[PDB]
Design a binder for this molecule. Structure first.
Ligand SMILES: Cc1cc2nc3c(=O)[nH]c(=O)nc-3n(C[C@H](O)[C@H](O)[C@H](O)COP(=O)(O)OP(=O)(O)OC[C@H]3O[C@@H](n4cnc5c(N)ncnc54)[C@H](O)[C@@H]3O)c2cc1C
Ligand SMILES: Cc1cc2nc3c(=O)[nH]c(=O)nc-3n(C[C@H](O)[C@H](O)[C@H](O)COP(=O)(O)OP(=O)(O)OC[C@H]3O[C@@H](n4cnc5c(N)ncnc54)[C@H](O)[C@@H]3O)c2cc1C
Ligand SMILES: Cc1cc2nc3c(=O)[nH]c(=O)nc-3n(C[C@H](O)[C@H](O)[C@H](O)COP(=O)(O)OP(=O)(O)OC[C@H]3O[C@@H](n4cnc5c(N)ncnc54)[C@H](O)[C@@H]3O)c2cc1C
Ligand SMILES: COP(=O)(O)[C@](C)(O)c1sc(CCOP(=O)(O)OP(=O)(O)O)c(C)[n+]1Cc1cnc(C)nc1N
Ligand SMILES: COP(=O)(O)[C@](C)(O)c1sc(CCOP(=O)(O)OP(=O)(O)O)c(C)[n+]1Cc1cnc(C)nc1N
Ligand SMILES: COP(=O)(O)[C@](C)(O)c1sc(CCOP(=O)(O)OP(=O)(O)O)c(C)[n+]1Cc1cnc(C)nc1N
Ligand SMILES: [Mg+2]
Ligand SMILES: [Mg+2]
Ligand SMILES: [Mg+2]
Ligand code: NA
Ligand code: NA
Lengths: 585, 585, 585
């Protein structure tokens, strides 16, 4: 006849297909805990060691599977600890439900222990942000929160006074709307607009197709269009892997987490097809200042003409539109622009290989990533933290459509490596999972290495120990007048941290040590987590946004200093290849 | 003729006497970093490993010295990481300035990398919350923020677009108002009201004086009034130490972080003098339901009649008022109420001593704290985390007016032990400093053990490893119908964590191991930090709020179960002593 | 045994002495209405015609009496209509309680009719901002709101779900803390700081005392210090009347709502004693750019050194400090500085009198205000709207300590004239009350002239009809490159509007009509409200901030143009008087 309101809430989560959720208990959320306890055969609670890891893992769940992530925090400090993960979910536009403990309705507004008005705390981050005040409507409020988080691709927060889930409600009244769920409709491309777009693209002297993760379903069409039309491809960093890295006309990404060929080509291009792309550097870096025609395909009307004035804009699904272009074109002959870019890519990849292929000496980030490549399975998943690792992984990882990689794309919160890998292994127990993190980021969430141990999640953790916030040191080098500050710090031995949480680990500092240690790690991670602490040099990775290679643009002295510092003696500027094929810079 | 606006900002901090500040750099705050770098001889930047530790340490600075604490975080995730420390500062009403990075005014509102409207993030926590938009007024905005944080005893947040501090401003225009600073005026007690208050207090059959930290300047007057009038003393937990723990009529604190004699006496009292006290449990625990007359002294009109209806309310300084009462009274003879309470205290202290005085066997929290007492200097400072340690430290630490102790009093954020100890050692390098933390709380901020190492801060860290969130397990025992959940977890060896950050450490699990390890730690902390990981039992500490000792109130079976579980065979209920002296319960 | 929670809420209001409150009913607040309906003998509900008028009137109640003002609005649009009054109360730092309707707890968060999360709406304006969720604690929440509004001198907002006030609660539990309310007894002003401040003031060659409303209790001391020491007085506009306008050495106020002698003298002064003053134009107008020493007295630490670099800032009560200064000084002979300022004031007053004393012709604001003066009782209260009326009333009204005048000082919301006058008459039925308003501001709240009729509040309304937003037209003349826009509009005949709400009224457009109309109005307002619609010219009043009178500073052409436009042929610059008494400019 009756059900506890907390039991009904957990049944709402189950109806929506929530497999696992994260948090840390407290008095203010013990009634939800009680309902979870009864339901442990059907829904799986993951106890983290810091609530930010719970929120970040919930975000990562949604990034990986498209299913809403769920986390919770107790009243006051439990909930405020969620913030970095909630902001990550907002900025990366993935659905997350966050439940926040609150003291009982009889004690609210009495200024009792750890009791405050919690609603204003979450107003900025959340698409939906409500304090529940009734037990009978609580299942509906949770249902509403989930349905909105999905529809609006963001964060729904519900503060729950602890008395409500222990109250009996009628067993027959509540329901979940999960059965009625659908994903948004995919708009179709206008035939005339697609034809006009195709004509402009074909008439270009120096075309590029520049796609983001909005094109994640269109890898085949992107590569086929590139091959057929002889048009180079470039992408946002997160869109690495949609087309295989091995594709010879994939230039990489632009700006800083970037590859040289992409920056150079973008500066020269006359027509850009900008597809499923919200590149946040467009305006500030003047990326498109010399672009003659700008053609955009996006599903979101809020994005059309956002990053540059459009000459043709198509409000449609990326794959449907790219298919429609491909359907109306035929094989084109090679062009000077095509060949110049192909040559430039070859030159760049030879540079990266030269760094990877060192066999002995002081360990650099480049060989560590080569060692990752050597033990990586074809469908491996990479959880990547924030800093130099984004740049280095972007250059060195050899990804295909079979891979996944995730980071904090836009909020760019450090510490996401560990939680992202926890979520990855929970969602894909049979797939190999890496956590690639700098020492600064790994330090921030280090305690949750214990969570990998506790739940026997065989993540391969690789920490890049430079004893610096390298990403920031390099920024200070570029901008600051006075000495470095706050960017060089004391060593932490992560192999000892790992030992502390009862995880097998290794520490290495020489290139020649890599093969055996990585082989051992590969084997250990068949059953248990493992950590490799790679002590790397303070060498700055080549700044693709600050090239000093072209004698028509840089002094002979700046060029040779750049070659020496970045081991880039064999790099040629794009202009070399443009000139070979009869085009001017 | 000109000065960089960032240089002027740092000069404002120097004028206000800021010695040290905390944070982690980033591109969005590198211009403030540049100004700090130039000023490193005069103001001292402390690089933390997680920004929440910076915010918590800033809060602790203000708790300890009364001087505004200063922290910062980079745009987006740097700033949102500050939240647990900022909420701590708000709820514990201490002045803190937080600077938040923001991207340059040319890139704001362009939806660029890690760029968002940051002002709404801080609206709830902050007394003052502004985004600076001009370089010439920036020193004033910082000055304003500091002056308001002090006057309003809370958090001032300023978001700073990174371009502004690198702009030149006239050298002669800016100023700091530090020279004009004063603390609020101390109101004087009305003579007639004090006399009426004194008469009511003297006419009481079962009086208590119940003080909080608002009486921190009135220790001498409190103890003297108690001795002269034969009136027992009780306090809030944070007010432990204002009167020496050894004082035989100090009952301790009420509720849960509490001592038995205080809970029992409060239930029986007819008149309570409530002084400098904002006890958050007053209403929810029905603390004063049987109190006949309620007399209050507080400096804040917002507090008068807040926690119970007052019969006499005095808007005045605690010390001035207590002095005025003492001036108009003379020595009173002993009473039955006085003797019953004295006997009860003796019985309770003998119980605590019996726990402390065990010499061998499985290690409990009680002997760990005895070992702390044995190596503690008379003016030691204690930074205490959140959980069972608050209860255990409250019972076992032997404090006097010469000590300081701090925790997160009201927000009660876990993880404060480490940052509180960092702040304590920075402010009091010649005083012994302890960090007393449970394993859950220590885990949350563990990475900043590295900060103690980096800045050579000789903190004595003591971790209470029960492999539980014990405080929460006990709550689930009390309230939950279904099995424990999320409260028992895997071991972390903190002696290995310490080794990882290059700190000397010990792990112990037997009572007989304590003396030598604590002696070694005492010696090490003359020069360097040290950590003791104390592996303790899962024994629940005696619940002072759930006594089962009085046969007129509890079954014989519940009483003997309580004695057995809490080793409390020799405890007597207050009623025993009331009856001895001819008073009924 | 039991009491309705709504009934207890009204008893809390009665305990705090709330005489009257304002609002408009709705379904979402009908349970509070129900409780008010039973208590008509003890609390007086005023039904307004627009909720902003209720909020503005509540703010005005507190401005006038120092007692908390109370208003309410129904859920959604009722509450949001309060905003202009709530912001006025926040900015003018007066205590106001606002009750906001909400739908019942069973329908909250169901997305029902007019149902939304109302808490974020009031977060910015409110010092205290909570949604009640329990009936038994509702009286406490209201009590807390009141106590906080008083303590923090601002707005407390409580959102009340409509079901709660109809729930029975135990009769014996609730209480109000009004009985605890008191004002603090302060120590004497800091003796050594006051002595030093005094020496600096007396050593000055060109001293000024510049006070604001913080000196409201110090009129006697201000005038005596001025006379004894030969130091001219100037004030903020709202501080007009604290010293009688007829005082020969009262210079007026500075900036734009200002008088010529104050602006001229301030520019010359070497030492300013800034007392109970938070002049918002200090920095932006560079008011103190030439000041050698700046001395301050203020009760609020947040203000110490806020507006200018301050040589000595005394934290103390204005009256007590000024009395302490007076007690340690004695007579100084007349100085050139004193004589020059006296002469300048005389010249300025002759100018104002020349405008007032016209007897025939096109009506100007100047003669209307002379007509007000001629019918004004010595203790009349003036509610003044926002625009040219602030400037003209500041110059022409002849106020003494027996008067009161109020406007929206800092938020400066138009429309306040009508509600301020309603509040004034409710608090002071036996005092004459004027509403002096421009046509723009009167139009915004015109419907509430019906409220004066409904409650038989004999306000004398005087509307200054120029068919312009004159204040803004003048700004456009000063700053805008293109034609006037939005500042000249169609006539509204307010005598006809008055007829429509059943109020006796007159319309005048000639100077010679004034005496008979104002005599009739004076007599009508012995019993009923009345309105005079004064059709005035579009003449720009003399801009005290743009003086062109001094041959050393302005071209002869500029001076002749200024003199012509502003009928200022007989005005002399201060430099003329300075030279006369042997001082240089
Ligand atoms: C430390 C760090 C540094 C970084 N620096 C760089 C850098 O230098 N270079 C770089 O490239 N990135 C960088 N980033 C990542 C960067 O901040 C952005 O997140 C990224 O460039 C945006 O990628 P995106 O447009 O693919 O994704 P999003 O911003 O998520 O945009 C996806 C777009 O696709 C659209 N879309 C979605 N579905 C469809 C569909 N079915 N059909 C059509 N359109 C669809 C959406 O409406 C949206 O406009 C960095 C990240 C980090 C952590
Ligand atoms: C895990 C945990 C559990 C806790 N549980 C308990 C518990 O069971 N029991 C317990 O007691 N505490 C407990 N607390 C602490 C608790 O939450 C409160 O912070 C504490 O009880 C309030 O102490 P207080 O009134 O001294 O301090 P505050 O809340 O800071 O109040 C100080 C008061 O003094 C007034 N004041 C300031 N200056 C003066 C002056 N010069 N003269 C007069 N008045 C002045 C202020 O206006 C204010 O009202 C716990 C804390 C933690 C971390
Ligand atoms: C259209 C319009 C135009 C305006 N333009 C002008 C203008 O040109 N010129 C002008 O002068 N005004 C002008 N104002 C008014 C102006 O905006 C400010 O409100 C006013 O100048 C500030 O006056 P104040 O300092 O007296 O009041 P407040 O800002 O209320 O300051 C009071 C001060 O006194 C202190 N205080 C309070 N009690 C005590 C005490 N017991 N002892 C000591 N200190 C105490 C307070 O802490 C505070 O610092 C205008 C208003 C309007 C509506
Ligand atoms: C009613 O309040 P509460 O829930 O009892 C309280 C005091 O708020 C606590 S206490 C607590 C357990 C602390 O565990 P520890 O292992 O550090 O200590 P212990 O085992 O009790 O010695 C948690 C998780 N929380 C909840 C909590 C969660 N997350 C953070 C950041 N802070 C908290 N404090
Ligand atoms: C312009 O953006 P940014 O400042 O360059 C950026 C990307 O935001 C970074 S990157 C970064 C350094 C990361 O250091 P690591 O040691 O982990 O990596 P690395 O040494 O570069 O290999 C910091 C501190 N921040 C700032 C930062 C601070 N705190 C958090 C929680 N996240 C951040 N991400
Ligand atoms: C710099 O401040 P400001 O813009 O000069 C100021 C004081 O804020 C004014 S004054 C003003 C004109 C008032 O016109 P009236 O006809 O009432 O008066 P007047 O013609 O000047 O005698 C307006 C529209 N505003 C703007 C205004 C608009 N709307 C509201 C509700 N209040 C305002 N006050
Ligand atoms: Mg690093
Ligand atoms: Mg524990
Ligand atoms: Mg007008
Ligand atoms: Na951490
Ligand atoms: Na209106």
């Amino acid at each position: 006849t009756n059900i506890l309101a907390g039991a009904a809430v957990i049944k709402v989560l189950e109806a929506w297909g929530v497999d696992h959720l994260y948090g840390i208990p407290g008095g203010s959320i013990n009634s939800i805990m009680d309902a979870l306890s009864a339901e442990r055969d059907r829904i799986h609670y993951i106890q983290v060691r810091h609530e930010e890891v719970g929120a970040m893992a919930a975000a990562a769940d949604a990034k990986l599977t498209g299913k809403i992530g769920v986390c919770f925090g107790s009243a006051g400090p439990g909930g405020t600890h969620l913030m970095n993960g909630l902001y990550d979910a907002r900025e990366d536009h993935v659905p997350v439900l966050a439940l926040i403990g609150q003291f009982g309705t009889t004690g609210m507004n009495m200024d009792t222990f750890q009791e405050m008005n919690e609603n204003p705390i979450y107003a900025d981050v959340a698409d939906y942000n409500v304090t529940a005040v009734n037990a009978a409507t609580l299942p509906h409020v949770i249902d509403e929160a989930i349905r909105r988080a999905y529809a609006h691709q963001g964060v729904a927060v519900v503060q729950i006074p602890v008395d409500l889930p222990w109250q009996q409600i009628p067993a027959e009244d509540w329901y979940a709307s999960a059965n009625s769920y659908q994903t948004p409709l995919l708009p179709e491309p206008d035939v005339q607009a697609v034809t006009r777009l195709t004509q402009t693209l074909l008439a270009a002297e120096r075309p590029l197709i520049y796609y983001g993760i909005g094109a994640r379903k269109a890898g085949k069409e992107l590569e086929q269009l590139s091959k057929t039309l002889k048009i180079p491809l470039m992408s946002t960093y997160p869109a690495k892997g949609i087309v295989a890295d091995r594709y010879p006309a994939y230039l990489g990404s632009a700006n800083r987490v970037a590859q040289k060929p992409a920056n150079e080509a973008l500066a020269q291009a006359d027509v850009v097809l900008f597809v499923g792309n919200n590149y946040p550097f467009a305006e500030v870096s003047k990326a498109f200042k010399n672009t003659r025609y700008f053609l955009q395909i996006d599903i979101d009307p809020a994005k059309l003409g956002k990053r540059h004035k459009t000459d043709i804009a198509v409000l449609a699904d990326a794959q449907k539109t790219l298919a429609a272009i491909l359907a109306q074109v035929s094989e084109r002959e090679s062009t000077p622009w095509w060949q110049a870019n192909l040559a430039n890519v070859k030159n760049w990849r030879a540079y990266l290989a030269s760094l990877e292929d060192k066999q002995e000496g002081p360990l650099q980030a480049y060989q560590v990533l080569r060692a990752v490549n050597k033990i990586a399975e074809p469908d491996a998943i990479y959880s990547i933290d924030v800093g130099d690792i984004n740049l280095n992984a972007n250059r060195h990882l050899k990804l295909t459509p079979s891979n996944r990689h995730i980071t904090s794309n836009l909020f760019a919160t450090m510490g996401v490596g560990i939680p992202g890998a926890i979520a990855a292994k929970l969602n894909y127990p049979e797939r190999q999972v890496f956590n690639l993190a700098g020492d600064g980021g790994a330090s921030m969430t280090m305690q949750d290495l214990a969570t990998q141990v506790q739940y026997h999640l065989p993540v391969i953790n690789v920490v890049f120990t430079n004893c610096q916030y390298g990403w920031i040191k390099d920024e200070q080098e570029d901008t600051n007048q006075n000495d470095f500050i706050g960017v060089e710090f004391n060593d932490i031995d992560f192999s000892k941290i790992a030992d502390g949480v009862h995880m097998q680990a290794f520490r290495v500092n020489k290139i020649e040590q890599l093969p055996d240690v990585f082989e051992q790690a590969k084997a250990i991670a068949q059953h248990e987590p493992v950590l490799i602490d790679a002590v790397i040099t303070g060498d700055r990775p080549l700044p693709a946004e600050k090239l000093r290679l072209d004698s028509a643009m840089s002094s002979a002295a700046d060029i040779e200093a750049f070659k020496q510092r970045y081991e880039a003696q064999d790099l040629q500027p794009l202009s070399t290849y443009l000139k070979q094929f009869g085009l001017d810079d």
